[PDB]
Amino acid sequence: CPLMVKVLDAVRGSPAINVAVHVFRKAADDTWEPFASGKTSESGELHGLTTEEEFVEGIYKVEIDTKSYWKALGISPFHEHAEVVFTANDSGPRRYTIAALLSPYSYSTTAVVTN
Amino acid sequence: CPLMVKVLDAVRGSPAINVAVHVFRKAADDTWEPFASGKTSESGELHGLTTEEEFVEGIYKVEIDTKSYWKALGISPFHEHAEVVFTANRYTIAALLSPYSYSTTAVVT
Amino acid sequence: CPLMVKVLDAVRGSPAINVAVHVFRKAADDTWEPFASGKTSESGELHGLTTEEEFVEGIYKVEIDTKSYWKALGISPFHEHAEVVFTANRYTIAALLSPYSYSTTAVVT
Amino acid sequence: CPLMVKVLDAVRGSPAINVAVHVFRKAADDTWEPFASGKTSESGELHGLTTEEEFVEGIYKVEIDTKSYWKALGISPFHEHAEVVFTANDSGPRRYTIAALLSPYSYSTTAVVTN
Ligand SMILES: O=C(O)c1cc(-c2ccc(F)cc2F)ccc1O
Ligand SMILES: O=C(O)c1cc(-c2ccc(F)cc2F)ccc1O
Helix, strand or coil: CCEEEEEEECCCCEECCCCEEEEEEECCCCCEEEEEEEECCCCCEECCCCCCCCCCCEEEEEEECHHHHHHHCCCCCCEEEEEEEEEECECECCEEEEEEEEECCEEEEEEEEEC | CCEEEEEEECCCCEECCCCEEEEEEECCCCCEEEEEEEECCCCCEECCCCCCCCCCCEEEEEEECHHHHHHCCCCCCCEEEEEEEEEECCEEEEEEEECCEEEEEEEEC | CCEEEEEEECCCCEECCCCEEEEEEECCCCCEEEEEEEECCCCCEECCCCCCCCCCCEEEEEEECHHHHHHCCCCCCCEEEEEEEEEECCEEEEEEEECCEEEEEEEEC | CCEEEEEEECCCCEECCCCEEEEEEECCCCCEEEEEEEECCCCCEECCCCCCCCCCCEEEEEEECHHHHHHHCCCCCCEEEEEEEEEECECECCEEEEEEEEECCEEEEEEEEEC
């Protein structure tokens, strides 16, 4: 599994469950094409987005729909969403985990990149 | 000054200086229109982006060119940039930068 | 002012006001001795902890009473406090607070 | 496994491997007693610190030896270590993951607490 997303909730100390995630890939003509989407599980994880074959070199945008998450919990947050934009697989294939930690007026994002 | 940006470097424990910042406002047709831009100062701060008059309610995007910042230091970064997207309904957008990670917070006072 | 502390609230997007901060210096016998203390201001800042004269090289501990802060808001927090331990060899110790998480950074200029 | 520690490296985008972790428990007389210790694996994780039976109610300090980690990589970091101090199991037993994200002049810590 070459692209995984993990989301945690810094207010509740829990995984962030059922968070919508949209992934896009920058096309030849510089527009963002829909690549893959899904939502985080009970463990705050989203797997199965893509395959090794499909996940070619490119610039990818991972959009985490944080606003809808916080709104469902009764919190009016600051951000519309958390976007993570990165070049992937430009010196051959890697496995990426995009991790986000969410608070209503703040988020943090890191990537763990392995061979 | 209703909107300011502050950027810090988590590797060096310093302001992140001369970092390009571009701000956009969402247009009626769902396009991002150029609003304001600047480079962070010696103190890692960017002031004077806009005025209370022009900073009306709307959806805004603040894009921080983190890649160029790391590249000028000879450090390979993960992200293409750091984007902060919010509805304006004083705003300080702060970002703390590492090569493979960033945090962003809004202080609204 | 060689040492200042700044605390922000990540739930409200605001300075964290009236937060108790205690600073200690490590003694020769490996004990923590009381050095300086204060409460954060309306801007979430604590200045005037010490002087250049007294702020000599050594190991320092900055303890931020985050538990009391959340408790006064009716929010059950995870941590007892936030501790920052460093060797002093201007220092701004910043902390960004959530109920189950905090981040701390040092800006040294 | 009721107490786990996970450590990531924000400079390299990798788990933080072989990081020393010391856990203490506040004793009756207000001193910190050695509870458990170990070091993070190739995945940046430390498991097997304690058992359900031993991990009673109390105030625990988890000390992550970040300075030694950064020094081994040629970086002179700001902090001596990252300390996480918390009351555990005070409304019955829980499972705790203490997560840290490390940069030379900054760290972040969150806890994920489950039943
Ligand atoms: O599985 C993980 O890698 C994980 C990670 C975090 C976390 C903590 C701090 C941070 F800045 C980002 C994170 F994704 C919090 C909890 C967690 O379980
Ligand atoms: O001026 C400020 O508001 C400031 C802020 C930080 C900081 C710390 C942690 C974090 F997640 C984000 C930040 F921008 C670090 C240092 C700092 O001076």
